[PDB]
Amino acid sequence: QYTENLKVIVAEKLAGIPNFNEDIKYVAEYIVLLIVNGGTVESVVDELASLFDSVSRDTLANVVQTAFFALEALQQGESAENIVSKIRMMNAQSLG
Amino acid sequence: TASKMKLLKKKIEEQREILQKTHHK
Ligand SMILES: [Zn+2]
Ligand SMILES: [Zn+2]
């Protein structure tokens, strides 16, 4: 199962959204549940937009798309640690 | 913000029940 790993990956992605004052672990769990229960990028984005009005739609879509891409990489055998490392790099915008 | 967190918790619980209903089938 990939659910526990995906939750950690989504929480890392959420940590990179500036001034996103929310309980990251619960938002990550919510996103992962919506996906597991058959959600699409659009249905998940729409549910998030109603909850978090301050964040732009493109930022939310970016988080959800990352979740779907990460699920696929996990199914393709990529380790969660490697995925997290790439997200940290994107969040920091630095090779270092 | 207390209200928003209660809402998110309620929504998570709803999704957990949906997942359970799917597994039972
Ligand atoms: Zn829509
Ligand atoms: Zn595939």
Q: At what angle do helices A80-92 and A57-75 cross, to 10 degrees?
A: 150
- The domain locations on chain A are 1-96
CATH of domain A1-96: 1.10.340.40
Contact of A51 with chain B, judged by CB distance below 8 Å, is answered with: yes
Please give the angle made by the CA atoms of A24, A25 and A31, to the nearest 5 degrees. Answer: 85
- Alpha-carbon distance of A20 to A84, in angstroms, equals 19
Domain that holds residue B1: 1-25
Q: Output the six-digit token pair for B23.
A: 């597994």
How many H helices and E strands in chain A?
A: 5, 0
- The three-state secondary structure class of A23 is coil
Please answer whether residues A47 and A34 qualify as being in contact, where contact means their C-beta atoms are separated by less than 8 angstroms. yes
Q: How many CA atoms lie within 13 A of A16 on its CB side?
A: 20
- Alpha-carbon distance of A69 to A73, in angstroms, equals 6
Residues lining ion ligand 1 (Cβ < 5 A) are A 42, 46
B 1-25 residues with CB < 8 A to A: 1, 4-5, 7-9, 11-12, 15-16, 18-19, 22
Total count of domains within chain B:
1
Q: Technique behind this structure?
A: X-ray
Cβ–Cβ of B19/A33 closer than 8 Å? yes
